[PDB]
Each structure stands twice: as C-alpha cells, then as structure tokens.
Design a protein around this nucleic acid. Sequence first.
RNA 1: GUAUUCUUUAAUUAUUUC
RNA 2: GUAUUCAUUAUUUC
Lengths: 683, 687
Amino acid sequence: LSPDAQVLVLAISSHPLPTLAAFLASRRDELLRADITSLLKALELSGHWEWALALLRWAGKEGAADASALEMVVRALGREGQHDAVCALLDETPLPPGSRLDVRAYTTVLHALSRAGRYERALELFAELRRQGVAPTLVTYNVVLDVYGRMGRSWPRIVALLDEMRAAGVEPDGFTASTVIAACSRDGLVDEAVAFFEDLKARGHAPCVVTYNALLQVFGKAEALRVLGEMEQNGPDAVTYNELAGTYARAGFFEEAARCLDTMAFTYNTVMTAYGNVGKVDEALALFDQMKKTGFVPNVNTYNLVLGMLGKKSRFTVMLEMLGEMSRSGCTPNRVTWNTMLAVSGKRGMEDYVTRVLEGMRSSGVELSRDTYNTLIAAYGRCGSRTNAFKMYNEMTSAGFTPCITTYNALLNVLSRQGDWSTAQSIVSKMRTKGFKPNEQSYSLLLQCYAKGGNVAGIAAIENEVYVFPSWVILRTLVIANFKCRRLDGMETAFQEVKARGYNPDLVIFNSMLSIYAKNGMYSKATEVFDSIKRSGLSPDLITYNSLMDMYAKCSESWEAEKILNQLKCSQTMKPDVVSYNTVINGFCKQGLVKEAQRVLSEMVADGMAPCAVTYHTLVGGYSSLEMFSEAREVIGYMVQHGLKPMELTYRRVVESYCRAKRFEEARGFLKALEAYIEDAQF
Amino acid sequence: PDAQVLVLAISSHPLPTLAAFLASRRDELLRADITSLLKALELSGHWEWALALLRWAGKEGAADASALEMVVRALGREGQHDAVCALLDETPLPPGSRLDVRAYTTVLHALSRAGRYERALELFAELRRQGVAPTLVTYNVVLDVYGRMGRSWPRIVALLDEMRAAGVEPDGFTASTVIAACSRDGLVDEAVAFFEDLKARGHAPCVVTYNALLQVFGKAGNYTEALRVLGEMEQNGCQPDAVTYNELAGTEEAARCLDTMASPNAFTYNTVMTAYGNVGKVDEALALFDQMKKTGFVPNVNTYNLVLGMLGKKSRFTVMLEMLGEMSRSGCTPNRVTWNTMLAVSGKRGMEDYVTRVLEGMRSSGVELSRDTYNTLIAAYGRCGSRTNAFKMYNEMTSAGFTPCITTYNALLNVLSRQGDWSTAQSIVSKMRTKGFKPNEQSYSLLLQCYAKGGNVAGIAAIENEVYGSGAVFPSWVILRTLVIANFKCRRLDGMETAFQEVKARGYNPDLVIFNSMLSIYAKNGMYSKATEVFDSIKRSGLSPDLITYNSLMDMYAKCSESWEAEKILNQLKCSQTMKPDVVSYNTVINGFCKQGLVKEAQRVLSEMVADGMAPCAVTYHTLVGGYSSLEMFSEAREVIGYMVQHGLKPMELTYRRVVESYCRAFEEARGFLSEVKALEAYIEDA
RNA sequence: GUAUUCUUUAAUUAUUUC
RNA sequence: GUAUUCAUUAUUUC
C-alpha cells in the first residue's frame, strides 16, 4: 500500500528474529501511526508469518493490537499449523480489555489447545466464548466434541452439546459422526455408540468410510462379525483395513473370521497382512488357500506380499512351495520376488534355502544383474556361508560386473563374524585401488574383525585415522572393540570423546566401562560409573549388577558383593543368575574365605537355582589355594557324581597346587601333559 | 622342538598368501607332526591357520584323519559350521580314510545348520556303512534333521527303535527334539503318546521338554491344552522359565493364564507380564497386574517402572498417570527411573499436557532437578513441540546453575526444526559455538530441516558447501538424506541431484523416500528421461513402489501431456490386487486431461470413480472446473459448481480465482457471474 | 479451523489443485 | 559335538 509502509515491512522481514523487538521499539512512533493489520498482512503474504507474530506481540505490549490484528495472525498460524504459537497468544494475550474475536479464530485456538492436550483450557475458552455472545459454528462444535472425546468420560456433556447445537439449528456432519464414535471408542461406550449411528440413520444422513472405520474401531478394542460386514456392503476399505490389523492382536480367533469372510482382493490381502505382521502366517496361508479355493487368481503382487510375510518368519520350505505354484500357474516371478525370497530374516538352515532360490533364479533365465549378485552375497552373508558368498563374488566379477561398495561391505560382513582381519585388510586395500573409498560401515566391520582377531594394531591404527570423522557408531564400536581386547587406553580414550561430542551413551558403554575397571586396577571410577548410569536416569542391568559384584570381588570386599546379590533377590525384577552366584563365590574363594563360599552355594541351590561346572570349579580353586586338597577332591566328585563334567583347568589348578605342596605321588595318584608337568617339577 | 619356532611363522603371516608360504618351508612341514602343528595353532586361537595348513598338507597328501578330526573339533568349538561343510565338500583326506564318530557328528550338525538335510542323512548312511557306531548326540542330531524336513515321523519312530536297539537310551535332548519335530508338522497326538510313553519309562521330563510339548498345542491350535501342560508342569515341580511364557504369549484370555498358575513370586509375575509386553499384548499384562495385587504380592518401584515402560511405548498417558498416583498412594515412591520412564514416552497428541502433569509431580515430589532431568524435560517438551515450554525449561536450567550441553542445544533445535524458525536456530548454534561446543551431525540435520520448513535456501547451500568440502560435517547417509528432502521441500532440483549423486557414490543404498522424491521433482518438470530412469532404478534396487510412486508417475505423464498413459496406470492399479488407486490418484489423472483438454474424458474418469464408490474431494472438482472454465465453455463449469455446495463440499480460494481470471480474459457475461455472491473483487476492478 | 488406524529417533503442511 | 520361543563369538573361571 503505502510506499513508506512497504519500506517498513521490507525492513522488518529482513531483520533477524532475536533482535527484532529492540528494533520495533526504535520505530515505535513510526509503527503506531500505521496500520499494523496491514503490516501483519503484508508480512504474512511475503511468507513471514513469524515476523507478524513478533509484531503482534510487540503491539499488544503497546496497546495497538486489536481483534483484527490477532485474528489475522491466528488464521495464518493454523493454516501453517503452529498450534504452539496459537496457544501462546492465548496465554499471553496481546489484547486490550474488551476484545472479542471472530468465531473462526476462537475455533482455531480451541483446536490448538486440543492439539496440546489442554482440554481443560479449551472448555474454559468455549464457555467464555458463548457468554460473550459468539455463535459457534459446525467446526467449533466438532472441535469441542473432540475435546470431550479425548478428555474422556464426558459422554453426557456430548449429549448436552449435540442438543445445544441442534436446538440452535446446526445440523451435524461427518466430522461430527466420526468424532463422536471415536469418543465412545475411547471409553468403551459400545452400547451408546451404535444407538447413536442408528439414530443418525433416522434423521437421514449418508453413511461413510471414515464413519465405519470409527465404528469398526469401537468393536475393535471393544462384534466385528455382523458389524464389519455391513460396513462393506453398505457401500472403501482404506484405513478401515488397518483397523483389522490390530483387531486381531487384541483378540484371538481364526474360525470366526474364516466363517465370516466365507459368507461374504485388497480386502483379502488386508486380512492376510493382519495375520503375518503379528506373527500368524499360518493363519494367513489358510486365508490364502481359501481365497484361491474361490475363483480368485492371485497375481505376482499378491504372492510377493505373502512371500514377504512368510519371509519375516523364515518359513523357507513354503516360500519355495509358493515359488512353485507361481511359475506353474503362469505367474512369473519378477525382480521383486527374488528380492523378497532373499530378504529373509536369518535362521538356521538358510543356506540351502538361498541355494535353492538361486537354482530356480538361474533355471528360469533371469540374467543376474550386478545388484542381484550383491543381494545374493548378502544372503549367504546372513547365514554365514563365507564359502558361498565368495563363490558369488567370484562368479560376479568373472562375468564382468564391477563390484561396488555394497559388494565389498557384504564380504566384509562375513569375515567380521569370524574375526578374519587378514582377509578383511585385503578386501579394503583392493577396494581402494579400484577407486572405492571405505565408508563408515566398512570401518565398523573392520573394527570388529580386529577385535575378534585380538589385533590391537589395526584397532589403534584406525583410532588414529579417526581421532575419518568419529560418528556415534564408530565411537561406540570402538569402546566395545577395545573391551574384547580388554584395552583400557582405547576404551577410556574414546569414552570421553563420546561425551565431548554430545552423545548420550547407552548401557552398553556404561556396562563395558564398569568392568574394564572392576577386573583392572581402578575401582572407583567404577563407582563413578554406577553413579553416572543412575544420575543419567538409566536403569541398571543384571549384567551391570553382575559386573558390579566382580568389582567388589576383585577388591577383596566380598560380603558387599553378597549384599548386591541378596538385594537382587528382592528386586522383584532382577533375579540373580548363576553368574551372580559364581562371581560372589569367586570372590570369597579369592580371599581364602571358603566356608562362606560354600554357604552361598547352599543358598544357591536352596533358592532353586542350579550350580554348574564353573561354579564347582571356583571352589576347587579356592580349596587348592590353602592346600586342603581333600575337600577339593570331594568337590570334583560332586560334579561328576552329578555329571557336571569338570574342566582341565579344574585339574590343572590342583596338579599345579599339588606340585607346590611337596606332594608328588599325590598329584600322580589323584590323576596327559599334566603328568608331564609333575615330571618337570618333581625333579 | 624346532616346531615352536615354525608355528609362530605361520601364525604370523598374511592369510591370503599363506599358501605360497607353506610351499616355501614345505619339507620342514612334511617331517613335522602335522596334527601337532594343528594342536599348537589352535592353542593360540589361530584356527584359520590350522585350516589352511590342513588344506595344504591335504594337497600334499600329508594329512591323516587324525588331523582333520583335530581341526573339526575346534571349528565346531569355535562355531565355524560353514568351514566344516567345506572340508566335507573338498576333502583333504587320502582315499580309504575313515573318521571318528565325534567328528562325523560334528559335521552332521554342521550340515544340519545349513539346511543341508538330504546330505546329512547320506553322510549318516555312510558313517554306519563303515561300521561306525553312532552315539547319543549322533542319533540326536539326525533326529533334529528328520524333524526339520517334514513328513519324517516314520523315520523317527524307526530310528528310535534302532538307537534303543543298540542299547542307546534317549535323553532330554532326544525328547525335546522328537516332540519339537512333531510340533513342526502338526503331529499333536503322536507327540503326546510319545511323551506319555516316554514318561511311563520313568524318564523324568524337564523344562526344555515341557516347553516343546507346549509349542505343539500353541503354535497352531489351542490355549486350553497348552495351559493344561503348564498345569502338569508345576504339578511336577519344574519351574517354567522365560521361554515358557513366550510360548504361551505367542500361543478374558489373561484371566485364564492366571487361573492355572494359581492351582508364584514377584519375579515370576514380571516374567509373564513382560512376555505379553514384548509380544505386543499389553492389555493382558495389565490384567495380571491387577491380580498380582488383589492376590497378595505388592509390587515395588522396579515392578511399576516396568509396567510404565510398557505403557510408554503405547503412550497411554492417562493410565500412566493413574498408575503414578496409585504408586505414591499405595506407598511406592517414584525414583529417577520412574520419572525418566514417564518422559521417555512416544510422541503423540496431548503429550504436552502429560509432560506438564508429570513435571507437576516431579516438582511437588520435592526432588531436586538435575542437569540430566532438565535435558530430558527439554527433550520431551521439544518432542511434542512445546517450543514455549522447552525454552522456559531451558532458562530454568541455566539459572539454577546448570550448564547446557550439546544435547541441550539439540533438543531446542529439534523444535525449531518443526517450525522452520531457522533464524533462532542460527542464533543458537553460534551460542553453542561461543560456549566451547561443536555441532554434531544431528545438529546439522535439525538445522537443515529447520531451513527447509522455512524456505531458506541460502542456508542449505551454506551447508552443502561446508559438507562437500571441509570436514566439519561428513556426508553421512543421514546428512545426505536430510538433503534430498530439504531440497525437495524447497524445490532445489540442482541440490538434490548432487545428493542423489553422492548417495549413489558414497557407497549408499538409497531408500524409497529418496527415490520417490527424485521421481516427483523430475515429474514436476518435464524431466521424463530421468524420471523413468529413477522408476526402473527403483525396480533394479529391489523396493516396492507405493502409491506416492505411482501418483508421481501419473503426474509426470500429465506434465508430459500424455495423460492417456496416465490412466493405464490408474487402471493398472485398479487390479493391482495389492494397491488401490487413491483420491489423489484419480485427480492426478483427471487434471492431466483437463490440462491438455478432452474434458469429456475427464468426465469419463470421474464417472467410474463414483462407480468404484470413491467419494471425490474439493480439489477433484476445482480441477474439473479448470478445463471447463478455460475452454470456450462456461455453461458447464457453472453446472459443475452446483455439485459442491449442493453436495456440501465447499469450494475455495484457488477455485473462484480461476473463474474470474479465466472468464475475465476469455467480459460482462463474467460480471453477472461474480455478482451471484473481497480479495478477488479487486481483480475484476483491476481488469 | 475440525474427524476414523499407523505414524512423533518424522518424506506424512509427502505426491494431485486450469 | 546335539534340543524348546524370539555388547550375547556380552559379565564370573583360585
């Protein structure tokens, strides 16, 4: 409008937001003389809804904001969807005393509070709304009914409002019906929901899709029998389908739905999906058969769906069967099919399956692409068939395809399992000359080959090159990788770096840290950790609790470890673990305290737990220590007398202790290379 | 002697070259106790090396069965099943060789773990063709093989006889395997008879045994018989472990499960509660929880937090709050875990008031807030989008004497990311900088998203330049992901191709979000060539095209003025059997005609749309008018209007704007049309 | 301005608007 | 070496 005002507006929309108020002040008099409403509008067209906001708040604090000013911002805020801002204009009103608003605007604020769970404020506002003589509209009504619906237990107030609205001649719509039914749905008002819809009929009213889904939902968590039926034939399965997907989980039946559906594709596929995503594939395959059994001829896309849900259950045998019915019915498998048959969540016996998929994948033409081979490598990688992954890697290249980074990472996954790093290094080095530079994943997979290789070299060699941006994964992978190698420098090093970069560490790191102190020479940072893990608000684990006991055990303070064990007995959620029992027994044994140690073994059994090899092994050590070899020999009996099968270390610890005690023929009688240990000892 | 020195050589050598290295010190090897070298190489965990030598020696003819058996024990002990199936397949033994049973059974199990059953049976046949006597574990492995093939019950009954006829007595491993086999075929009756018959032999069953007998009933059948087993279980005195309740959980139904185990402890109750939780059936666990009380045992804070956590993931606010009150009313006073659990809730509607209602309890609970608690509260208020309250929580943090961390600044930017309020987002990151803090990646993602919802393209590019060069921010899948999106929302084609470039270059494997966006952006221009290449490349990737992929394709053809091809897909989606055309699908098709004309065709589509049920929207009609509004025709676009309010759908701003502009440019016959009923009637004035 | 399940470490003010 | 459901080639081995 005004050239002076256009300059002012441009000057406002260009100014940063944090400084703007100190700026608007400087132009106080300049602003007051103008039409803010016109500035707000101009600041809204230009796409700067947040600058008008600032202006409004400024003017309210000055007295130059009117209803129309506010009403303009609000309409902008709701179309833009900034409920928070709406709610704040209401909590810090830029309005002068009198001040009444347009209906549309009040209903936008009501929706904003609703959107925030401030149902109690919405109702306060609604009351204030009609005591100022504002005629609410259909949308205002529907918004308020929604407030009542999510606030809960407000059915009577809903009856009241429906009355009030009709008595003022505002007939309900579809947003009114669904809103209401979902309200009954959230309160278990099954009975009164139906009487409602069936009253909607009376007064006239065309039924709907969203309606039925709401009604559906009622009987859902609440009947889906004679009900869900109507919804169909009444008239289209859109969202209504999903409702079936959770209908099954909150209940339990396979006969009614078969008996129902019988009586009657997507619709079919929907119900099948409902079964296979909650883990009822046996239930879906039956739905599939029934479906086939009645005319219906599935296409490749229906098979890919069934195979897809069978796949998450690793039902190899029937996936191949389905693969059969396809190709022998015309339904030629597509790319999506093989990818589906190869994206199986790994189980035991996956290799031969994969092998059979590949056999039909190549006995049916289908030229394997580059990505196809990568998919086939990943598959044998899941199983762990290094042998078959690499045969695929070799067949690949030998056919002229060029391996990508996805192909190298695949192979790298494998070796990682087996901690074969000497082969990993070769992969990496190969990929570099080919031009391919390792990514983050490629590194984590290296860190894991090394750790299972006990190669600290390659570990610290990467630590260097990273300290390779250190991502939360890499730093977390490094903390672990060092713990397998039990490396305190490395672990600690990158521990604080995880904090200095604004990452929140999980119980894994904390647990891993606590123990690299317990079994080491630090026993206070440990206490720091168990105080940090808590101060952090995290819930300690048994493993955490067990690692804890090991600390006290190594600090020669065992009863305290016994306390934590006992305290676990009440935990009501924790519940010891022979490890916890073992760990405590190991400590007492380590301090010469062995009666106390078998006293906890007695509890152990009494509690109905189950002593094991390692458990007995501990005592034999602690007995051998203070040379009292008879009570020790009595133990190994117990193990075997109960068939617990001792360990050569159980024997060694006695042999080596029988040697040092000047008793040689004893070491001999009692009793491989061990006897040899006595010979090189005796003389 | 001289061996200890030679082992270290092989133990310290590049694996992919060890062959030619064993070829080197060959004659020192042939005179060395191979099996001896093997035993040594394993004593240091160098088992990959003991294999390579085996294969070497084998190729030289220097490996005997005693050696192979030695490598196999380790592999099995080191869990290397594929490697053993390899030895089976290549054969490093000379002709006429026979192996220990312990080894043979280690291979059988290895063949079993790869699904190579038909092969395991053939090896078993050989093993007993060499007059080797199988042991218990051998018989048991083979049983496990029979049980995973299917239709193998007679072979199980027959082998049971043999093994029992060789004086070999079944065990718990046997029982669980035979029962579990019957569970994998639906052999309910025989599993029972077998159990009955096995019991009657004096065999005391056990947990594992009872667990398989229960999977029978529960897998595909009944919850009443499986529950009965649960019955007979305790009656025997065998305590159901965690795996027990998992079977039931996966097998008014919660009222039953509690009636049986009634004729337990607090840990028991939690074990079954958590079972139903981890399955996804939580209303049941609640039901038990109602009983654990009205039955005696009183739950503590650990038990309650457990329950709250379950509710958390379902974000069942009101009940969570009820439960927090019953806690503090029945005596159970919350802890730092209780609160944190309460604020770790899943985003949703009305979450802001919940958090306020929780914080209201943290405060009254006279519990000093810590630096951590603030970070949580800021995060939750930031997660629901209560920008206002996050910042209030923020200033309250930095005023009680706590120091923000990066998470603290990240929470805050998360909110702004939803609002697009990048100006503040900037002002923050700098503050993060002026405090000795360096922005994370997510910090860069948030800021990125923050610029997107706004429209600030200069801050995006300012991120790309700092990402495509310096190391301040590494091109992480995430960061490149947040870029394809933030450039779409701002329609920066150039800046997406670069990202789709690097993604398909930095070793990444794009996702449907990325593909589709690329498809819609190319389609939003005439970019047919690339777009179709993207679509197929979705196919060549191995992903399933959703509706948005199909709608974007139709709009491309629309855009390319081939709207007939657009309907072929709508038809194709009509019989997709898996994908049902969407409202936006139909419109996209109609507009494509109306954009090039043939509105009588546009009517053709609308017709069936209604024929397929399908209830049209405003846009549906606003588009139909477009063609009828600007096609030397007005008597129709007026008749079409009477289908909106007369059908209570209510037109809109883009609509009428097409009526005046199109009519006031096709005059007077336009004036009377607009008179039939603000911001517009200045266009007419402008004309 | 409003409704029916998933979505809340979010493509869901995602793709259609002569 | 072998079995039951769906950081673990995790924490205890005088």
